[PDB]
């Protein structure tokens, strides 16, 4: 029943600082060593750091060079990574992971869901949200265009999460502008469902943008 | 640093077991682990201590380590086994090291033509003097498509941005393509079309500004 829930990602400028958090549950946290590992978008896994069950000994990858600090709070079942003097190449999804092999080698037997850390000199930009109305016919596709935002990620739900069947949120395109766009589509019965309201719930946390857009004819 | 050499891409043919190697100097003196990462998912431990399986990992996943080579083998290969597989061990001061990762392709999966959905610009966007045409491409296999845009049947040369294909949950692929115009550009033609080529055949959708 182990769970590892992370928070604390977002956009930061070169030279800036950020703190990541990893909340643990479902196991005796204070008996386990804990790791951080990172993955640049579309790249491979790269170890960051590990900390001992009771927090004395900490070890770091060669690139950290004193800039990051791993810590834990065993009374709150929390694991942290404080990241300072960040560089563009530090952009990555950061995972926390439980250790379960030591002393018989390393084995990262459970991983958190990951949070994205974007290091960039560019400003955050909130998206414009436009309805994608059907036309085209016993089922109909309707959707929302999330246009011109920075950085990733954007999340999209439909009818506040009540609508999940037939929903497809496409990976974003990165235009030459340096801004992202994405679309999210839901396929529904045509005619039969005009008796239903359709609303996409777009959230772009880096820009403080949360928009609910109704999609009608 | 250390090493851990993995072939970036491995393909397995129908009926064969998959075999994924991982080499490093002294690797046989260390314990190797193997992680499976399916698209959009977190890594999952499949082998540890060279040969051991966590609970809930089927026995058709086996691991070994001898000489300088760790090997992950998968019998009874299924389409669901397509994923990136990472080996890992440690360097000279016992610091965790990962291999480069191997992407596993399972051959013999059936072809699937793309579904193509094309949306015209919204009235709201046109009121802002912009016009983005959105062409969504879903459920194709294998994952190679070419996307061409047309204005009144003539090839568009500017304003097009298309994603790389990305693996869906069902092992099929999806992509999108955007034609970003101004409202005036949108009104300057009678029709625009998104045309997807896949395995020598094409699917085209058209929209018209004048209703």
């Amino acid at each position: 029943e182990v769970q590892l829930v992370e928070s604390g990602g977002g956009l930061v400028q070169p030279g800036g600082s950020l703190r990541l958090s990893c909340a643990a549950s479902g196991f005796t946290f204070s008996n386990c060593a804990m790791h951080w590992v990172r993955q640049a978008p579309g790249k491979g896994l790269e170890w960051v750091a590990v900390i001992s069950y009771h927090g004395s000994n900490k070890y770091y990858a060669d690139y950290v060079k004193g800039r990051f600090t791993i810590s834990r709070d065993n009374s709150k079942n929390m694991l942290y990574l404080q990241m300072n003097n960040l560089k563009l190449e530090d952009t990555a999804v950061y995972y926390c992971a439980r250790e379960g092999g030591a002393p018989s080698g390393w084995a990262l037997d459970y991983w958190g869901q990951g949070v994205l850390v974007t290091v960039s000199s560019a400003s955050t930009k909130g998206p414009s949200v436009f309805p994608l109305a059907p036309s085209s016919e016993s089922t109909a596709a309707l959707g929302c265009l999330v246009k011109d935002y920075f950085p990733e990620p954007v999340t999209v739900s439909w009818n506040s999460g009540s609508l999940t069947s037939g929903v497809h949120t496409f990976p974003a395109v990165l235009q030459s502008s340096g801004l992202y766009s994405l679309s999210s589509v839901v396929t529904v019965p045509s005619s039969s469902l005009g008796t239903q309201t359709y609303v996409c719930n777009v959230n772009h946390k880096p820009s403080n943008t949360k928009v609910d857009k109704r999609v009608e004819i | 640093s250390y090493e851990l050499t993995q072939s970036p891409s491995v393909s397995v043919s129908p009926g064969q077991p998959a075999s994924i190697t991982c080499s490093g100097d002294k690797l046989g003196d260390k314990y190797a682990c193997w992680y499976q990462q399916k698209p959009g998912q977190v890594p999952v431990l499949v082998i540890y201590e060279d040969t051991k399986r966590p609970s809930g990992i089927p026995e058709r996943f086996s691991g070994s380590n001898s000489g300088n080579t760790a090997t992950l083998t998968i019998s009874g290969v299924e389409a669901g086994d397509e994923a990136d597989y990472y080996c890992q061990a440690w360097d000279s001061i016992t610091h965790v090291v990962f291999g480069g990762g191997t992407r596993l392709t399972v051959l013999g999966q059936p072809k699937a033509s793309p579904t193509v959905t094309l949306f015209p610009p919204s009235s709201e966007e046109l009121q802002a003097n912009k016009a983005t045409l959105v062409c969504l491409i879903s459920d194709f296999y294998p994952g190679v498509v070419k996307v061409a845009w047309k204005a009144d049947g003539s090839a568009v040369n500017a304003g097009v941005e298309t994603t790389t294909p990305s693996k869906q949950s069902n092992n099929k692929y999806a992509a999108s393509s955007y034609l970003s115009l101004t409202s005036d550009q949108w009104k300057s033609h009678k029709s625009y079309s998104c045309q997807v080529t896949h395995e020598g055949s094409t699917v085209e959708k058209t929209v018209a500004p004048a209703e």
Binding site: N31, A33, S52, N57, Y59, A102 | Y31, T94
Partner: peptide
């Protein structure tokens, strides 16, 4: 013995309870 040698390395790390 591989396990004995690996353990010697990890005991020096001192990251899990003994």
């Amino acid at each position: 013995d591989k396990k004995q040698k690996v353990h010697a390395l990890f005991y020096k790390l001192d990251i899990v309870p003994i």
